[PDB]
């Protein structure tokens, strides 16, 4: 409504927008005036995204580990909406195991889906942003990228790698008005964390000074803040939203 | 006037609100609905703050190194507005010198004004915030607190100390719904930076990937973000707003 | 000679030990009493390593992106020397380019050689170290992993990912007396940096407060320190050796 | 007696060397060939230090919050030994309390003893080091300076401030061959930690992945490493020795 934190005129691509954090992000960006394209791995997922976004955007199937899919999706977005102004890299997976039990495929799937995809998508949207001298790339990371976590050495490596990538990209494109940042959630209430048993939830909560889980809307708010015109002077930064679980 | 980033019902105390970053902070917090009390070291300064805030708040004279002044100001605020919900510690000074030329008084003035004042004011507002299980303390730091800077070892020590204090306070009060954070500006255009000669401005700008100075409004935006209900899960954090001058 | 920083009785595997930092590491570990196996990609390289190590170890050809090679090398080491007590992950490559010019293979080669290899080798040596309740894994990183660098987003991502991996592994194996750490060199004098022209060397040196390049022996000293019994209480740490280029 | 980590020819001043970490530091520096002057607040303390150092140094009474004491001690050192080549700032105190119970004097004593004393002593030794283009200043910090700790906001602020001061000083003096660093111990076994009850020790140990307290000798080793010729390319750094309690 006001000129504050106003994304009217911006086209936002949010990967993994079916539920939880990704859905919260897509919804808030739309609320702040962005035209939003949210993605899912399946066509039915894409249609559910189209359904909740309505006139403020649409859902598309995207395979974030596949070049042709990325090419097809960006072409469709450029044609209907104009080029992507805001990229939110939210799609990620876990393949947890202690290192002695971690399979080669569990390592590689994480590298592919959680790190390499960020290279590929970021590169694919950057040309347009640099031509316009205006852009936002926001990665959805994790506290685990900074703190480490036993049983998630793969996930941690990928998330930490994304921050290395982010800082380097930030340096490359800052003078052309593109910012590149990471939002790092702590323990956030999703269907996945609701699947944990009571002892696991208590143990995890014991490490959160705030004494609760984060809401997906809280991660969305941080992403919407960095996406805004007002955040033009923030780049190469990692915004920690973890209820005090880790303090840098 | 939406429910997004809405500070209606909050009382904000912003120290050093006469100009630059402090004035931008006070103005934006008022724009987002906060009742704002901005402070200056003199009554005439206070009146100029009253003048720009109008119906959305008022100016008061505060000596941040003096307990009696703090007591008097908070009593007057509590009486008219209710207790402080948001404290923005913005008042600071510089006493620059290389260490071999740094005087005892230049060290001690900085410790007093830039560090000890934060202990005192934070302690004075915390009791009310904890009773309400709601509060925000936001320190205006500097990139120098994290990077260090030749010729500002005193300023750097105070800013870095505020972060240590912030993380410890955050741990103490997180479970009672009070967040404590720092915003760390880089090189921001103020009357002071406009006083620098061309060679100094160029040398400084050469270290900023964004290739410009920050605006006081950009610092205000980050403070307003952390002050918001939406930032409830961010505590013990340092939000860097430096155009890529330093990346953590 | 003395009991201080004494590696007698330890078997050290140092990848990429033909020249520069890797050779310096292998030589110093041998000087401090370790039995050292250094690796190269070629048999002639391996023989050169055998030649400089003499009675204090031997050189082996290792392809750090190939499982069978790793398996063969560790079997040979275990047979002759006993199991690896100290792993130094030093072998790395660069594939520099600005992101808009970075090829898929330049990204993937870096992920393979600079990140995935560390997963594979670390996992392959960990079982023996954990059985003994004694071990050291030391990664040779780079300041670029923490700072970022334009034109090296791939290298930065890998190095940063190694630190995420390191912290997670540290958490997993700390209680069993294995430490996992990274040494992060700045600008070090090697044949590669000697290949740079005068303007590039000057520009790079301008960002080093120390006003010189680091020596490979300085990186070796830091690695030897973390490898020592005396460094048993350091884990999940990144030791920066960069002449003040970046300060964390 | 090798050329490795050899401090022969260096004069080291170690403040608070009566017991624990300070005594371990003084003893190891002497073992590595340094002429060591260890300090205590009393003459009897000084004599006990003289007693353990024997021919390798001596004890002196120093009041670290008093300029005249500092002047007298450095004059006596310069006269007998030559100017200080290595300063280890180890003397510190605690004045623990939750912020709502923290007295003005408990804040100010900590600032004086744990922060301002570091400014004063560092400044007093720097001139000689810079003239020689050789020097080491090593601060004994704490994990609390980086992590924060409830009930130690004053201690945390001082330790964090020392790091800010350290980075700034490092930038000022790096090109003249003086390094300035911090060693940050975690939970170390001292008489003080042995005074804690079982529940406190268990709760603290639960946050240490290594599953034990650190030894004072482990802190000494890290200080000796940074004091060495081999650590000439490490400046503005914080070396964490905390058994994985915090990972940066």
From Swiss-Prot, chains A, B, C, D:
InterPro entries: 3oxo_ACP_reduc (IPR011284), NAD(P)-bd_dom_sf (IPR036291), Sc_DH/Rdtase_CS (IPR020904), SDR (IPR050259), SDR_fam (IPR002347). PROSITE patterns: ADH_SHORT. Pathway: Lipid metabolism; fatty acid biosynthesis. It comes from the Bacteria. The active site is at 155 (proton acceptor). GO terms for molecular function: 3-oxoacyl-[acyl-carrier-protein] reductase (NADPH) activity; NAD binding; NADP binding; oxidoreductase activity, acting on the CH-OH group of donors, NAD or NADP as acceptor. Keywords: Fatty acid biosynthesis, Fatty acid metabolism, Lipid biosynthesis, Lipid metabolism, NADP, Oxidoreductase. Its EC number is 1.1.1.100. The keyword Transmembrane helix does not apply. The keyword Oxidoreductase applies. NADP(+) binds at residues 16-19, 41, 63-64, 90, 155-159, 188. It holds the Pfam family adh_short_C2. This is 3-oxoacyl-[acyl-carrier-protein] reductase FabG.
